[PDB]
Write a structure and sequence with these properties.
The structure is cut from a larger assembly and holds 2 copies of chain A.
Chain A: no helix or strand
PDB class: transferase
Keywords: CDTb, Toxin, Binary, difficile, transferase
Entry title: CDTb Double Heptamer Short Form Modeled from Cryo-EM Map Reconstructed using C1 Symmetry
């Protein structure tokens, strides 16, 4: 008169999350050297009284 | 992970597939059913 029957169900214990990023670090160094030359030429003229 | 099985009792068992479970501190990382790689063909009793 009674029935043969299962009843199941779940229950959560814990929930874990996780993120999604993208990190990076950069480091650099710079070395440089230069040189310069020049040759100029000029003229002047004037009058006083 | 590196792991070996064992057996105890009376009977052998063919085509074994264990389902394993990992735990760090209260949490659960993963539970894996064995794939075709780590399947085991035979286990004579009292062996590994």
């Amino acid at each position: 008169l009674v029935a043969a029957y299962p009843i199941v169900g779940v229950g959560m214990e814990k929930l874990i999350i996780s993120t999604n990023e993208h990190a990076s670090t950069d480091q650099g160094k710079t070395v440089s050297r230069a040189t310069t030359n020049s040759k100029t030429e000029s003229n002047t003229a004037g009058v006083s009284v | 992970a590196n792991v070996r099985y064992y057996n105890t009792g009376t009977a052998p068992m063919y085509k074994v597939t264990p389902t394993t479970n990992l735990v760090l501190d209260g949490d659960t990382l993963s539970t894996i059913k064995a794939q075709e790689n780590q399947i085991g063909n035979n286990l004579s009793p009292g062996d590994t």
